[PDB]
């Protein structure tokens, strides 16, 4: 266990930027699996096992309080 899925929720309903990106719904939950890029792009997996890039700038965690 080194990089578990990071649970995030989208603040709006968007569908990638090209055909290689993931599609999420407003309030849907996704699990990031890779790191963020210079364009705020993050690679992850949806709960359905779908893989691709998702706009990190359009989502936030839904884990615990900020502290």
């Amino acid at each position: 266990m080194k990089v578990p899925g990071v649970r995030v929720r989208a603040l709006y309903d968007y569908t990638g930027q090209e055909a290689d990106e993931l599609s999420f719904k407003a309030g849907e939950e996704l699990m990031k699996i890779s790191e963020e890029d210079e364009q705020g792009w993050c690679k992850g997996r949806l709960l359905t096992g779908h893989v691709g890039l998702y706009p990190a700038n359009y989502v936030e965690k839904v884990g615990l309080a900020a502290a």
């Binding site: 706009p55 700038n57 359009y58």
Partner: peptide
């Protein structure tokens, strides 16, 4: 990066 993202974000920031 792979491709030029939808970025910058749309809203929910400045409050």
């Amino acid at each position: 990066t792979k491709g030029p993202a939808p970025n910058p974000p749309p809203i929910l920031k400045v409050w």
